[PDB]
Structures are given as C-alpha cells and as structure tokens.
Amino acid sequence: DEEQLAHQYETIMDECGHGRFQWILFFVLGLALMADGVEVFVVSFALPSAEKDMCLSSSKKGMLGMIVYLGMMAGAFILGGLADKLGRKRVLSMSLAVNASFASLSSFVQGYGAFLFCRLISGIGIGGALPIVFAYFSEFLSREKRGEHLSWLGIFWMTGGLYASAMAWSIIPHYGWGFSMGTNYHFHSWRVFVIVCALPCTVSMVALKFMPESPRFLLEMGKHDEAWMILKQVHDTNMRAKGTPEKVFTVSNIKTPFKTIFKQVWDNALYCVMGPYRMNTLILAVVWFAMAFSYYGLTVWFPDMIRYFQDEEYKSKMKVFFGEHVYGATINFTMENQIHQHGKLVNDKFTRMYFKHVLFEDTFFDECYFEDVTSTDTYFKNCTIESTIFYNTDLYEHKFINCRFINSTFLEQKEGCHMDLEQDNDFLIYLVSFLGSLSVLPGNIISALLMDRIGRLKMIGGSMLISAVCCFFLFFGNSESAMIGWQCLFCGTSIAAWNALDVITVELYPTNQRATAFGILNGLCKFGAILGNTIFASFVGITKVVPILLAAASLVGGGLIALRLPETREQVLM
Template sequence: MQSDSANPVAKVFFRIRTELRGIWLTFMRCFNYPVRDNTIKLAIVWFTLSFGYYGLSVWFPDVIHHLQSDEYASRVKTHNNERIEDFTFNFTLENQIHTNGVFINDRFISMKLRSVTFIDSTFQNCYFDDVSTVGSIFKNCTFVEAFFYNTDIDDSKLVGSRVINSSFHHNKTGCQMTFDDDYSAYWVYFVNFLGTLAVLPGNIVSALLMDKIGRLSMLGGSMVLSGISCFFLWFGTSESMMIFMLCLYNGLSISAWNSLDVVTAELYPTDRRGTGFGFCNAMCKLAAVLGNLIFGSLVGITKAIPILLASAVLVGGGLVGLRLPDTRGNVLM
C-alpha cells in the first residue's frame, strides 16, 4: 500500500493500474462458469446482427441510387448527323448524346447542359452566353470562331477538342451544380428516413409482445425473418420494391435489437453486467465497421454476395440466439 508521503504521480499511476487490473479481472470473469457459454453466444449474436444491419444500411441507398442511374441512362436520347443553323437554344438540354453534329450560327443563351455529350461535332460562328454544364463534355469537337461569355466551359469539358479563332470571356468559377441537378444526397437521407420511420411499429410490437412470446422467440424469430427478407432483395428490380424491403427489414430487425438488449442485461450477474454488456457492444461496433467496409466495397459490383452474406449471417445469428437460456420470469442475479 502506498504511504501518505509517496510521490503524487506514483499515486496516480498506482490507482490507474489498480483500476485497470480490476476491469481486466471483471472482464475475465465474464468467461468463467456459468456465464462463459452465454458470453460467447451473446457475442456471436451481437456481431452478426450488427454486421448485417449496418452493412445493409450502407448498401441499400447506394443500390437504389444505382438503379436510378441505370434507369436514367436507359432514357438517353441519341442524335446523329444533325445540322442546325441559326437557332437559339435557351432551354435545358438533358440526357442526350449528339454525334457528328454541325451547328452553324447558333446561339446558346441562358441555358444548362445536363448530362449532354457532344462527339465529333462542329460549332461554327456559335455564341455561348450564360451556359452552365453538369456532367457534360465536348469530345473530339471543333469550335471555329466561337464566342464564350460567362460560361463554365473550359479545358476539362473540351476533351480532345480543337478551338480555332475562338475567345472566352468572364468564365464562371466554382461549382455550378444545384439541388435540381443532383439530388442523390437528398435521396440517401430520404431513404434512411423511411427506413428509420419503419422502426416505429417494430418498437411498438416488441414492447407489447416481448413478455408474452418471450425474449428468445422474439430475438431468434426477428433475426431469421430479417435474413429471409434480405434474400428477397434478390428480386428487387425497382426503387419502390427496394424501399419496401428496406422498411420491412428495419421493422423486423428492431425487434431483435430490443430483445437482445433485454436478454444481455438479464443473463449477467450484477457484478458483471456492465462489463459483459460493454464487451458485447464492443463486438457490435467492430461488426459495424466491418459491415460498412465490406458492403460498401460491393456496391455496384454484385447483388448476390451482399444479399447471401447478410441472409446467412442473420439466420445463423438468430439460430444461435435461440440457444440462449430463457430469462422470462427469472429473478435476476
């Protein structure tokens, strides 16, 4: 024991070491009989539920965004060998591809080019005034005696193009993209909002039925049903279907989260409850990080691996959860 005259710094380090040793001993007691099996099973359930839940939370919005992009690309309009003279473009051109076009004495005024590509086209004596581009390029085009004023058309938009006797004045600077041009950020938040909203009925159902059907039945049943609902994502080919499956998945999985919290707290004795719960939460956070990394890397590559992985993990975790001892009606230790 440290004396009163001991160095204050040494006292601090001694106290820290003592506390850390106590924490470590308490943690190791979570793996002693009779709670060792429960700790291992709970860690597996926490890990699998978190891995599937947070992994799909990242995967869902990006997949929906890819479906939107594919649908948008399928509606592209293609124009070949067109010749337009003495025409004024003062409206938005969107989702178009112009190949081998000839534009003579045309005026592009107060307009926006949104996802428009010009390929091998010629612009002769054309006037560009207050033109903004979003996702648009001029590839292998030729500009002859063109005049650009207050536009954002620069070298990055003129890919392999030739500019002959043309001038640029008062070019726009900064990002010209607006909310109307790209709402993908809004869409990600909106999809997450719908998924979070679907949690509300799941919370109500779990609160009303947990004591009636039992913690384990709700835990295992919710995880197995969540895994089955993930499998049906394989057949999701539209935005509305994917959003519906997201809401169904979140509504089912929240019941598993609620029952898992209760089961974890009731399976540990009082002197190890906080440490055991903290260990399970640490496994949860580790699984969340791995889920975000793994599922995020598979976005846009394949649907099979994320769906099968999430389904297998959730069903497996649910079956492990059903092997936990039932704590309904038991007196806490």
C-alpha cells in the same frame, strides 16, 4: 452472499415498483440513445460531404464515419468497461460531455480533417454511452417486467433517426460541403445541422446530473448509506405521485461483501471472454455481429439502390446524337442526356442553357456562341474548337479533354452547377432513412408488449427468421418503391431482435461485468457496421444476391445459434 443480496434488491425494487421515477429515467436515458441514432445517421448517411457538389452521380465516401465507427468501437471498450469500476452515471456523463463538446465543436472547424477528428471523438463518447444506458436502467426495474420496460428504450434510437433525417433533408439536402469548408454563412448549413444535432445529448447530460447513480453499483462496492438513500428516494418519488405518500421505506439494513484503473478494467473484460461467461459471450458476440452487420449493410444498401435504379431509368434516356449539320440554332432549352459523337456545329447559339450529361467525342466546332451556359456533367473529349466565344458560362476549362482552341476567348468564372433538382437524391436517401426508422414503431411496440408475455429466446428466432424471409424476398422486388416497403418490413421485424438481445445481455452478466460486456458487444456491432457499410455499398452496380445472401445467412446463423442461449425470465438480475 451475492445471491441473497440480489434477492433482497429484487424484493426492494418490487416494493418500490414503477411510477413517476422510472418514466423520468426512461425519458432521460432515452435521449442518450437519441444521440446515438443521430450519430449513426451522421456517420452512415450524412457522410457524402465529399461527394463533389459540382458533379452529379458522384459516389458516396467511406471516411466521415467509417473511422467514427472505430471511434464507437474504442469508446464501448473503454468507457463501457470503465463504468463497472467508476460508476454508470459518472462515465455516462463523461461520455455525453465528450460527445456534446466534440460535436458542437465540429461546427467551427475550417476543414474536413478537423471535422473528422472531432466526429471521431464524439462517436467515442456516444458509443461508450449506449451500453451504460442498458446497464444503468437495468438496475431500477423489477424482474416481473424487465423486458417490456427495457425494450421501449429503442423508441429513442428510432426517434433520433427521425430527428436526424428530418433536420437533414430540411437543412443539408445537398452534398459536397466537405471540400475545405470555410468559416462563414454561405452554404454553411451543415453547421446549423450539427448544432441541431447533439441537442438530445446536451439535454441528457444536464438531466443526468439530476439522476442518482445505480444502487447495485453502490451496493456491490461495499457501502449502504449511499444506496439506502437512493432506494428511499425512489420509494418516496413513486409514492408521492401515487395514492400512498404515507408509506415509509421498511427495509433498514442489507448485506454486502495512477495507471491502475485500466489494469482492473482489462482484468475484468478478460474475465468476460475466458473462464466463466466464455460460452455465453462467444455466442452473444456472434449474434450481435450478425445482427449489426446485416442491419447496417441492408439499410445502406436500400437508398443506394434507389439512386441506382433512378440513374438506370435516367440512363436509358441517353439519346445518342451521332447526327450532325446543326445550322442557325438559338438553343435555350435544357440539353439533357445527349452524347454527340460526330456532330458538325455551325453558327450555333446555346443561350441561357443548362448542360447536364452532354458529351462530345469528335466535333468540328466551326462556329458557335455560348451565353449563360451552365454545366453539371458536361465533357468535350477529343473536340475541335475553331471559333467559339464562351461568355458568362460555367468555369470548365477542365471539361475540355484533349482538344485545343483557335479563335476562343473566355470571359466567365464562379458559377455553380445547379444546387437544386439534382441533390434531391440526398433528400431521397434521407427520406428513405426516415421512413425506415418510422417503421420501427410497430416492431418495438409489439416487442415491448410481448417480450414478457413470452420468452426472449423465441422472439429473436422469429424476428431473425422473418428478416431472412424479407431478405430473400428482396431478390424479386427490383423496383424503386417496393425497396422502401421491404426496408420498413425488415426494420420493424429486426428491432424486436435487438430488444430481446439487450434483455438477454442485461441478464447473463453480473453487475460488475454487465457494462463491460455490453461495451465489447457494442464494439463488435460497430465493427460489423463497418463491414456492412463497406461491403453492401460496394455492390450497388455489381451484384444483387451477394449482399442479400450475406445478410440472410448472417441473420439465420445469428438467430439459430442464439437459440443455444437459456431462458432468462425467472432468473434474478444478480
């Protein structure tokens, strides 16, 4: 029966073992996670393209990928469940192709709506791709080390995070390119960035063609000749490199059992949430939602908090110039953080000036000349402009809030605010994301090195405990750099939890409801990511415990309720 089939397959993979083929597959399928990390970045951190490039302090957006996450929630449901009926390589290839097409295609649109509609489908693809990776590499390993050799794969998610962060603060260090983007090469670097991205997926898609399909899938459908060749192929591949190329595959025999393919996928996914696998899934869903919500919320809450603290340190410097009587001033030095409520400007000359955070609430502008005057967040509210000659200044006929002119004549247009030393905030959030992924190296290393030396049920509990402790420690370190250290710690501590959970999820599910489950759970993780990136980011200037307590409580409830899951070490793959 199926038990004997699984026993025979485990003996087979123990005969073959590891070598020149498992490493190749780990490097290939890794590139399909690399692209998932790149997309997670493009969706959570490279979203601010709506931030007004002409204004600073502008708040981030919630559309670039808040809707692309819903894309990864529909691709995990369909493409992740369509694998157990069509294959784990066929649908993985389709997913990666959708992503690489509608990603490299988004580098040509002339607007944000088309860019959004393209990144949506790219996310669909990659989110359908992720689960199939773990349900496809989990069929070439051996029960002895299914946890270690399956946890290293997370090294590629981190790798895509680094790739995207670096190629972003190196290509798109600015914001405000989602403003009816044109088709040219003027400040059009997001195109070169989107092209640099999709390279991991574009390399996996072509490297996937050279890879065989999962035998167990070809062994459950009811055919052998299409599988016994793969097994022979893997044995030869791992023996040629090793010192025994003369060993021949000993096993010879083995035992085995439109508008309709989606009905089968539904009847399959429904068997995962009701009947058998209802208790193991109703808990894995909880743990997954908790993990993902917490992680995404907290990794979006850190850099935003860095920027909030930077602003607050910049805000205290606001030097209210309620004074007046400025006479004969050839002013040419930058004028930052000033609000002249009641000022009397007479015969003044702001020449070669840069206005940043300069407000005027009630000014009798008797006379003043303006030249090469640039503005970022300037505003003249209830002013009184008597005789001012604005020449070669910024185009800011809108900053004049409710006040008219008498002797004015404007001869300026087509100027940019700074396009420098202000978007360093986006450079900073990209660098924070980089340093946060770069800290997952020790976490994933120790995870893969210990996931087999000890259980997978206690690693989850320990990692979630330490993440909750880090969270509760964040309530004290309200600094601008300590937040980065706490991010590094929380990340390097959380990675192990996701590894253990991927292991426990490749177990607990037969080979027919493995990718389906994985896909539903990835969709739940993406919904939790939506909730996190929409909740935590909405508490950067309102509260500091609400999101922290949410994340800590979610992690504790996902780590202590996960202990209700069994130990899956000696259990066969099935």
